[PDB]
Amino acid sequence: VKESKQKIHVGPGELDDYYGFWSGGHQGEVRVLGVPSMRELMRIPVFNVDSATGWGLTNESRHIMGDSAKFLNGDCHHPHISMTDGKYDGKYLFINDKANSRVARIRLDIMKCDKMITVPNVQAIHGLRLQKVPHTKYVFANAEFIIPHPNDGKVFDLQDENSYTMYNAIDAETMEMAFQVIVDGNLDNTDADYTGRFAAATCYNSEKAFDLGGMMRNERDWVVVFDIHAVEAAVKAGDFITLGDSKTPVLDGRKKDGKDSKFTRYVPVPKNPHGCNTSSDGKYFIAAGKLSPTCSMIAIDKLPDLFAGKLADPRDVIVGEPELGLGPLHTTFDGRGNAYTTLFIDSQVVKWNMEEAVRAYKGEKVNYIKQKLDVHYQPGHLHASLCETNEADGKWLVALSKFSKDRFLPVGPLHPENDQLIDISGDEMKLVHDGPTFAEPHDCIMARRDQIKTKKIWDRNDPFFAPTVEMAKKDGINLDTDNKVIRDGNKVRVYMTSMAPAFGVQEFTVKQGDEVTVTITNIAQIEDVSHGFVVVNHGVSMEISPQQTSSITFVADKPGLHWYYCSWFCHALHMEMVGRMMVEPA
Amino acid sequence: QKIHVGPGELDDYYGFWSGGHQGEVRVLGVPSMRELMRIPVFNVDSATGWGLTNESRHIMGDSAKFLNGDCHHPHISMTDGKYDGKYLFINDKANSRVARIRLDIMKCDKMITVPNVQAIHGLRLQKVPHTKYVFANAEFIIPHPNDGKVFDLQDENSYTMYNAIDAETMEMAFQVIVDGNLDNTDADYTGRFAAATCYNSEKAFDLGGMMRNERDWVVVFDIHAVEAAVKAGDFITLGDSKTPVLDGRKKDGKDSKFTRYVPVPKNPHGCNTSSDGKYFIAAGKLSPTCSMIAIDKLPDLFAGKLADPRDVIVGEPELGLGPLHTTFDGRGNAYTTLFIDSQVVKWNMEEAVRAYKGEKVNYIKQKLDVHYQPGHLHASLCETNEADGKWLVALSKFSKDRFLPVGPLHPENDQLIDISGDEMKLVHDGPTFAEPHDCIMARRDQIKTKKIWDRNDPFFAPTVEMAKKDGINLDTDNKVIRDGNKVRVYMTSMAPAFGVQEFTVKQGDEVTVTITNIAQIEDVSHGFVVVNHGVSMEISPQQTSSITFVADKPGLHWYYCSWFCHALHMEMVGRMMVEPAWSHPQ
Ligand code: CUZ
Ligand code: CUZ
Ligand code: CUA
Ligand code: CUA
Ligand SMILES: [Ca+2]
Ligand SMILES: [Ca+2]
Ligand SMILES: [Cl-]
Ligand SMILES: [Cl-]
Ligand SMILES: [Cl-]
Ligand SMILES: [K+]
Ligand SMILES: [K+]
Ligand code: NA
Ligand code: NA
C-alpha cells in the first residue's frame, strides 16, 4: 500500500523539481518546461525562424543551419538527452526534423541549438533515439519514406530494387554521419539497448506501398534489430559502399533471396507497429501494436543467439505479447517493473506488469493489467520521468493527447494539444494537470533539476560564435573593447560593444546598396541583462546576452535615416537605447 | 477567488498576451495562466504556415518579406466603452505595422504598414461611441522626405506623426504631425480626445539630449477638429501616400487647432485612461510621479479658456522610483508599476487630487514587491467602464532566480495578483518568452469563437476566386491544372487521405497546392508538408489553404499530413514526381 500524493503546486518563489524538454511539433522549436508546474520557462529555436533572438537571421545561426537556413520550417517529434552509463549526463539534447530531413543538437549548458545536419540521401527524419551505453556515441535516426537511389527522376517506382530507406547513425560529438544501413520496408520509431551492441526500429511499411490499404495489408510488419558491433566492424574493415556525393559509409541490411544480412534481423510484429521502447531494466524492446491491440516484447538477452543462428525462428525472441486495448502507440516505464502504454482508440493509459505479461505469454493465467486511466483525448506518446535511463524513478508521467476538445476554453477552429501530468508515484495513476500546448509536441523528456547545469553568462571562447571572433580577428578587432566601422568596398562591418543603456556605436553612415554587418558584444557581467538590436523597416532583429557576441547582415537598400533600437528591456533608459544608420543615396 | 483550474475546469478569462520581439499574439487562460493558442502575426509560423501560405502573404502584403516583428500593445475593439470581442489590434515596432486579429477565428486577418513613419509603438483604440479609429504612435523622428539629403532631426521637415487607422477597413484615416516624439497613447470615453506621451521634446539622438528637459509633455488631440479639417479638405499628403496629413506642431508659440501640449515630467511613458473616464494618467518614469490630466478640463483648454496648459493637471502624486504604467480596479484605485523600486503601488485617485490642492492626505494605500523590474500592468477590464477589480497582471522584465536556470537568456515574470480585496495578493509567477510587454484580459463570455470555418470567409476568398478562374469547385474537386510552367493542384482532404495523392510536374515548375478540409467535425485539422522543400501549412475543418513553391529537385518527393488527425495519421501521405530538366525543353 503506497498512495499517489505528490504536490503539484509550485508557488511564487518556489522552484520546479524537473526540467521538461518538449518537442515543438510542427512549429519547429524545443521548449523547456518546469515540472510539476508544467509552465514554459524557455523556447529554444531550432528549425523555426525566431524573431526574438534572431535565430535564422543572425550569421551565427545561419552558419549552424548551413544551406538548410533557406528553410523556415521544421517538424520535430523526438527530443532525447545524451547518456553516460545508461544515465542522463546533461550535455546535449537531440531532436529530429521530419519536414526537411535533419537532426539538430542542443547544448544544454547554453540552451541553444549548436549543431545541425541534413541527413544525406533520405527523406523525412522521424524516429530518433540515443545510444545509452557506454555513452551516447551515436544518435540513431529513422528516415521514414522509401525513395529511389539515385532520386534523379528516372525511376519513381517504390518496388524498384534501388528504392529503399535507411537507418542512420550520427556521431553525437561531431554531428557528422557515422554510417547508414539500408533496410527492407520503412522505419517508424527506434530505441537502443543497455550495452551498445543493439538498436531496434519498428517498421509499418514492410509492404513498400504508398497507399493506405497497401500499407496495412501484412498481418505483421516487423521490428528490425541492428547489430551495431557488426556494422562498426564492417565500417572499420572498409566493406561498405557510398551513395551519391555523400562520403557516408552505407551498409546493406536488407534480406537477399531469404538470406539475412550480418547487420540486421527482422522480427515479425503486428501490425503497422509504432512505438519502439526499451524497458528501463534493459530486458525488452517493446513495440506498440497500433492496429493490433497488443504490445510485442523482444527479449534483448536472446538477440545474440538470434544473430548467431542458434534460434529456429525470428519470432523466438518474442517473449511477451500482451493484449492491452485499442490502438497501442507507445510505452514508458516506472522502474518498478511496470510498463505504461497509451491506447489511442480507447483514449487511455494502461499500466501493466512486464514479467507477468511474459508469464502469460507462456500460458499462465495471471492478470498483468493493473489499471486503465482515461485521458483526454486520443493519446500519442507518453513519458515517465527518467524512463530512458536505469534510474527511472517512477514519479511523474506525461501523456500527450492529440484532441483537447472541451478541456480548455475554445480558441477558434485550431485546438491545443492536451499534455496531461499523471502522478505514478503510488499504486494508482492519478491525473493532476491538463497542460495545453501549441502545434502538437509529440514526445517530451524529463530530467531531474540536478541533471542540468546551465551557464549564467556566456564564455568568450564559446564555439557558438567562434566564427564571428575569427572574422573580427581578420579585421584586427578586439570584440571586448572595440567600437569601429570597417569599410571594405561596398561592405561595411560595424563592431560595437553594448552596455545598458547605450550601444557602443550610436551612428554610422553607409552608401545606399552597401551590405552591412553589425556585430555586437554585450560586455555586461551581470546575469539577465540581455540586449537586442532591431533595424527599423529592414527585417533585422537579434539578441545579445551577457558576454555574447552576435552578428547580422543586411543590405542598406533605402536611402535616408534609419533608426535601430534595443529590443530587450534592459534598463530604466531602455527606450532611449537607440542609434542611427544614415544611408547616402546612390 | 479561484486560483487553480483543475482538470476539466475552464478558465474564467481569456488573456491576450503580446509576443514581444517574437512577433506573435498568445492566448492564455486566466487565472491558470496557461497558453491556449498562439496567433502568428509578424512571425513566420512553421506549424500553420503563416508567412508561407498564399493567404497569409496576401494579408501581409509586401511586408511578407520580413520574418520578424516587435509587438507590445494588444487591445480589443469596443462599443460604448465595453469590449465587443470583434477584433484585437497590435503594433509592430520593428517594421512599422499595425495588425488586426479576428477574434472569432483567432487569426490575423489584416495588416498595414503605416506610411512615412518609423517604429509603431504605442497603440490603443477609440472607446466611444465604438472603435472607429485605431490610434498608433510612430516613436522616431525622421526627415520628410527621407531621401538621404537631410539627416538632421532639427530640420523643419524632420518629425514623427500620430496615426489613426480605420478599424473596419484597416486603411489609414489620417496622420497628425507633432512636435517631439510619441511613446504610449490612450483615448477618452467620448470620442473627442486622445492623448500621447512624448519623451524626446528635445528632438535629440543621444541619451543626455533626450533627458535634457525637465518636462516633456502629453500631447492631447482634438479628434473632432482633425475630422473636421479632413472633411473640409484642409490637409496635405506626403510622398506617394494619399493619407490626409494635418500639422499639429506649434509654430512660433502658436497652438495648432488639433493639439495641445501639456508639460509633464520627465520622459513620461505610460498614458492610461482611468475606467471612470475622468483622467489621462501619465507615468513620469524619470520623475517619481504620475500626472493626471482632467479630461473634462480639456474642452476649455482647446477653447483658450485656460492660461497655462498645466491647468488641466489636477494631480501629480509622488509614488516611487520609475513609474511606468497605470491600471485601474474600477473602485477609484489606480495601480502603478515602479520599475526601479520593483513594486506595484496602489493609490486612490481622488485622494491624490486633494493632496495636489494642498490637502494633506495619504493617497498611497499599498506597495507590493514584484520580481523584478515591472513594465506594464493590466487589471481585468481596466480599459472599459466594466473594470471589475478582480485580477491584476504585472509583467516584469527580470526574473533572475524566480524560475529554474535555463541559460544566459531568462524568461520574463508575468505575475498574477489578486486585487478583489483591499490588499494586493501575489498568487502566481508566470514565466514567458520574448518579453510580452502588455496583455489584455476579457471575460469568457466576451469572446465567441467559431469551431469550423465558413466557406465564404474573406481569409481565403482570394483563393476561392483563383480557383474559379480554373473552373474549380473547391468543395469537391481533386484536379491538377496545368498552365505553362505553373501547376495548380486542388484537392479535398478527409482523414486519413489526401484527395490528390500523387501528381507529376517538370523540374522548375512553380507548384501551387490548394487543399480544402471538407470535414464537419471540430478539432479535425490536417497539415501538409513537402519534404525538403520548406513547405508547411495547416488546414482546419472547412478551411481552404494554399501554398506555392518551386519543384527545383528531380525525383520523387513525399508530402505528408503534419497534424495528428487519425489512427492512420502516419499513413496520410502523397508523392510529387518531378521529371528532370534534361528530359524537357531548354
Ligand atoms: Cu512522430 S510519432 Cu507517435 Cu513520435 Cu509523434
Ligand atoms: Cu513598448 S512600452 Cu511600457 Cu508598452 Cu513595453
Ligand atoms: Cu539595451 Cu533595452
Ligand atoms: Cu491528416 Cu494526420
Ligand atoms: Ca504494414
Ligand atoms: Ca526628454
Ligand atoms: Cl517510440
Ligand atoms: Cl506500483
Ligand atoms: Cl500605456
Ligand atoms: K491537435
Ligand atoms: K528580460
Ligand atoms: Na552541420
Ligand atoms: Na493591408
Curated annotation (Swiss-Prot), chain A:
- List residues binding Cu cation Z1: 274, 330
Q: Which cofactor does it need?
A: Ca(2+); Cu cation
The protein's enzyme class: oxidoreductase
Q: Where does Cu cation A2 bind?
A: 566, 568, 570, 574
Annotated keywords = Calcium, Copper, Metal-binding, Oxidoreductase, Periplasm, Signal
Residues that, per the record, bind Cu cation Z2:
77, 126
Tell me the residue numbers annotated for binding Cu cation A1.
531, 566, 570, 577
Pfam families tied to this protein: COX2, nos_propeller, nos_propeller_2
Binding annotation for Ca(2+) 1:
402, 417
Q: Where are the transmembrane segments?
A: none
Highest taxon above the source species: Bacteria
Q: Which cysteine residues pair off into disulfide bonds?
A: none
The record's Gene Ontology cellular component field reads: membrane; periplasmic space
GO biological process terms held by the UniProt record: copper ion import; denitrification pathway
Q: How is it modified after translation?
A: Predicted to be exported by the Tat system. The position of the signal peptide cleavage has not been experimentally proven.
Lineage of the organism: Bacteria, Pseudomonadati, Pseudomonadota, Gammaproteobacteria, Pseudomonadales
- Matching CDD domains: N2OR_C
Chain spans, region COX2-like: 490-586
The identity of this protein, by name, is Nitrous-oxide reductase
- EC no.? 1.7.2.4
Which residues bind Cu cation Z4 per the record?
A: 442
**Naturally occurring in which organism (per UniProt):** Stutzerimonas stutzeri
